[PDB]
Symmetry: none
Subunit: 62 residues, 6 copies
């Protein structure tokens, strides 16, 4: 194996643009999970049994 | 293996731009989790059983 | 293995830009977790059973 | 005018790959110009009368 | 004018890769110009009358 | 004018990779100019009349 003048990009996030203007936003939350923002997760390896990799807005009442 | 003039990018986040202007935002939260901001997680390796890698807005009432 | 004039970037976050102008933001929080800011986590290795790697806005009532 | 999370690329050259293997190449040159290599020119502005912008393999016997 | 999380690239050259293996190359040159290598020129502004901007392999017998 | 978390790249050269292996190269040169190497020129402004900006392999017998 050999790379010459190359580029590898395993597991990335880029160029996320969010323009929000003139916004009203009310939220009442009891017990649950409210997610209103921007999220960006970048993982190469996530190993494991029962694992929860990159949860967002999660409610687990086991 | 050998890299010449190369670039490797395992597990990265870049170029996240969020423009917010003229914003009102009210939040009442009891017990739960409210997430309104910008998040960026970059991990190469996350190993383990039952592991929770990069949770965001998480409520676990086990 | 050998790298010549190379660049490796395992597990990084860069170029996170957040412009916020003219913002009102009220938050009442009882018991839970409110997360309104910008977060950036960069880990190469996170090993362990039941581990919680890079939690953000977390409520655990086990 | 305003750019948000943008990219401008006025006048560029990129991703020029030339693989040459097992090559014999003889050149005799008298008076003239022999050009056998790879060239990449990138200019934003070249102004002027009679100007010669980015000549390659040029012979001028005025 | 205003740029937010932007990128401008007026007049650039990048990612020029030339792999040459097992090459014989003879050159006899009398008076003229022989150009066998890799060249990369990057100029933003070149102003002037009669100017020669980025010549490569040039013979001028005026 | 105002830049926030930005990048400007007026007049640059980058990521020039030249791998040469097992090469024989003979050159006889009388009077003229032989150019066999790698060249990279980066100028922002070159002003002037009759100017020669970034010549490479030049012979001028005026």
């Amino acid at each position: 194996v050999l790379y010459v003048g190359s580029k590898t990009k395993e597991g990335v996030v880029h160029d996320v643009t969010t323009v929000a203007e003139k916004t009203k936003e009310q939220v009442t939350n009891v017990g649950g999970a409210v997610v209103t923002g921007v999220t960006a997760v970048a993982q190469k390896t996530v190993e494991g049994a029962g694992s929860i990799a990159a949860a967002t807005g999660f409610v687990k009442k086991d």
